[PDB]
């Protein structure tokens, strides 16, 4: 049975926007709170979650992936301290912005990736795809405005100026991690998960440590984040978040596996209606003119330049 | 340190009116939920009332219907809770809890969803 279940189309990509949706929903619903500050902790126990996850499949022999080597981390370092500043200022962006809003606004990192390739990595822009950067940038000023017309005060305003600052530098690290780390993988030859392993090694001590620095960790303080009559539904979150990335992870690796490439750069754009509209069931977000149109001029140009690189790689 | 900051309880006779706030101590209420739960002496936690910050929309408790007035000054991020005809059996902890969620996962008269806590004031009604 497990057999027929393995080779199917439709199963792998349902796995794979379910898996995406719940990474979402558990990250927004732990970071927003009222008191949450420790976000440093929050991804320090989301990644300790995936090595203990993939160390477990490994064993059950489910994945396999490279064994640690110390001169084999020395030159990993860099890209784990890139991915510490990425995640971090996406948890901060995602608490101060809703989920539709952050999805939107994470179509401009596709605008510094591309033009980012063309300086040194020595790419080019079709007109398709320059088309879709007009439209991604039309979305963001959209939902700027329908963020904007709910805020009448002095405060409800600087939460929006902080949400977009996070949102800003989230772009710009996320644009460095993906070029670096493409840089580098030419050099370590990381194939399928070795890759995550890595990744969430190196960025455990990172972010243990930052949070000692950074983070309030005092008696007080965490009373606050984790209240005693709260602390089971909030570490059920914590834990189906940090499992959910290795979720996504298997189940993309399985999605191309089966249904090529060219889906599953098609499933990617389609699945984020589906990550913008679980903002809205989920959580309290604005509806109105500016707001509404914003996903669907988003998602319109997410999927033009989905189409775009189709048919860049086909010539 | 973001905390909330229940103010205006007390004693007072049977029949009466009371008052009382949740201030916030950091951010602003906007895309919560402030709802408002009692402890009584010997029994455990009751939904008195809540609302929806953007949008203005109010949950009542069943007994507390006509009586409690829960309202939002926006200028000042404060909730209140005005308290009126209060019977004895009123005499509890008042909490202030802010919460995310919606109301389609879970009601709003559900205490899970609720991921903040104020240390709540006592009303006392003789
Ligand atoms: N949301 C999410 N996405 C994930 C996760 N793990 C991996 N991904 C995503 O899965 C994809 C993995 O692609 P890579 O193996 O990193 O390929 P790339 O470096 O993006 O490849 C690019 O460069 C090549 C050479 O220039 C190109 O051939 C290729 O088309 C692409 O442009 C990326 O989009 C990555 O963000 C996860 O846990 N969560």
Same mark, same amino acid.
């Given at each position: 049975?497990a ?7 439709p199963?792998?990509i349902?796995? &794979?926007?379910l898996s995406?949706?719940?990474? @979402?929903?558990?990250?927004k ?21 995936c090595?203990?996850?993939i160390?477990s ?9 490279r064994?640690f ?10 890209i ?17 912005l809703?989920?539709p809003? &952050?999805?939107?606004? %994470?179509?401009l ?7 980012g390739?063309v300086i ?20 963001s000023?959209i939902?700027?405005?329908?963020d904007?017309?709910?805020? %009448? ?23 460095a991690?993906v ?8 050099l370590?030859?990381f194939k399928?998960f070795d890759?995550? &392993?890595?990744?969430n ?5 990172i972010?243990?440590?930052?949070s000692?620095?950074?983070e ?8 606050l984040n984790?209240?005693?009559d709260?602390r089971?539904?909030?570490?059920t ?10 979720g996504?992870? &298997?189940?993309?690796?399985?999605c191309?596996?089966? @249904?090529?490439?060219?889906?599953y750069?098609?499933?990617?754009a389609?699945?984020?209606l ?8 989920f959580?309290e ?14 998602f ?7 189409v775009? %690189?189709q048919?860049?790689? %086909?010539? | 340190?973001?905390?909330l ?11 009466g009116?009371?008052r009382?706030?949740?201030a ?7 895309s919560y ?6 402890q009584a002496?010997?029994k455990?936690?009751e ?6 910050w ?11 219907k ?5 309202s939002g000054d ?5 909730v209140?809770?005005?308290?009126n005809?209060?019977k004895?059996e009123?005499?509890?902890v008042?909490?202030?809890?802010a919460?995310?969620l ?6 709003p008269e ?13 009303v006392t009604?003789?």
């Open positions: 049975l057999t027929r279940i393995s080779n199917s189309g199963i792998s349902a796995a &794979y926007c995406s949706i719940l990474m @979402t929903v558990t990250n619903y732990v970071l927003s709170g009222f008191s949450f500050n420790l976000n440093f902790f929050l991804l320090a126990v989301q990644s300790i979650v090595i203990v996850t160390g499949l490994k064993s059950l022999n489910i994945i396999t992936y064994q080597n110390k001169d084999e981390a020395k030159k990993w370092s860099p784990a301290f890139l991915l510490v500043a990425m995640i971090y200022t996406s948890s901060k962006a995602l608490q101060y809703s989920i809003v &952050y999805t939107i606004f %994470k179509n990192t596709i605008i510094l990736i591309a033009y390739e040194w990595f020595g790419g080019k822009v079709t007109t398709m795809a320059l088309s879709s950067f007009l439209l991604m940038v039309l979305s000023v939902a700027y405005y329908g904007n017309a709910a805020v %009448k005060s002095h405060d409800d305003a600087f939460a929006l100026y902080l949400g977009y600052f996070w949102m800003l530098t989230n772009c710009f690290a996320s644009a991690f070029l670096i780390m493409r840089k580098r993988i030419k370590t030859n399928d890759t995550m &392993y890595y990744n090694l190196l960025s455990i001590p972010l243990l440590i930052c000692f620095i950074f309030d960790w005092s008696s007080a303080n965490v009373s984790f209240p005693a709260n089971v539904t909030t570490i979150a914590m834990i189906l978040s940090g499992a959910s990335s290795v996504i992870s &298997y189940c993309s690796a399985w191309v596996r089966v @249904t090529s490439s060219t889906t750069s098609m499933v990617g389609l699945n984020k589906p990550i913008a509209l679980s903002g809205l069931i959580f977000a604005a509806v109105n003119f500016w707001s509404v149109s914003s996903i669907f001029v988003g319109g140009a997410g999927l033009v330049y989905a775009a %690189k048919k860049q790689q %086909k010539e | 340190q973001v905390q900051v229940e103010s205006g309880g007390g004693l007072v006779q049977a029949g009116s009371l009382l706030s949740c916030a101590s950091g951010r602003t209420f906007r939920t402030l709802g408002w739960f009692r002496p010997g455990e936690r939904f008195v009332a809540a609302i929806k953007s949008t203005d929309t109010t949950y009542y408790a069943d007994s507390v006509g009586r409690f007035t829960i926006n200028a000042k991020n404060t209140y809770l005005q308290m005809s209060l004895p009123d005499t509890a008042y909490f202030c809890a919460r995310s919606s109301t389609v996962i879970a009601g559900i205490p899970w969803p609720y991921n903040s806590w104020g240390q709540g004031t006592q009604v003789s």
